[PDB]
């Protein structure tokens, strides 16, 4: 509904203020995790099919695709198996890709 009336600047301002007021007694580092409507709001606005304009998809592609293909290259180079990826800490393996 907010995209139909282009009131997304109004909805984003008031969803932020209402969420942060509710979790304001909680500490600052977990304003995003201890809330309930904050993370699903930004996830639907910037990562959904019916919201994201296709020019923004091509930008999200180009910043991420050298990074993800470098992660794929370090899998094939040192022959990391499928279960070795998901049993080992992801930080130890994919350090150059990060």
């Amino acid at each position: 509904l907010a995209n139909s009336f282009s009131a997304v600047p109004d909805l984003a301002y008031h969803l932020f203020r209402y969420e942060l007021k509710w979790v304001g007694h909680l500490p600052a580092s977990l304003f995003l995790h201890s809330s309930s409507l904050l993370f699903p709001f930004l996830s639907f606005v910037t990562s959904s099919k019916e919201m994201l304009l296709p020019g923004d998809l091509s930008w999200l592609h180009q910043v991420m695709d050298p990074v993800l293909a470098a992660a794929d290259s370090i899998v094939a180079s040192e022959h990391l198996s499928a279960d070795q990826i998901l049993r080992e800490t992801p930080a130890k393996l994919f350090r150059p890709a990060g």
């Binding site: 009336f5 282009s6 009131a7 600047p9 109004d10």
Partner: peptide, 27 residues
């Protein structure tokens, strides 16, 4: 004629300006 109560006016800062033309125009 029961009474009169009050009258309130628009602030300014709290008014909303949502609209598709607020960022785009057509030729």
């Amino acid at each position: 004629r029961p009474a009169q109560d009050l009258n309130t006016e628009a602030a300014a800062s709290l008014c909303r300006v949502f609209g598709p033309g607020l960022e785009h125009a057509e030729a």
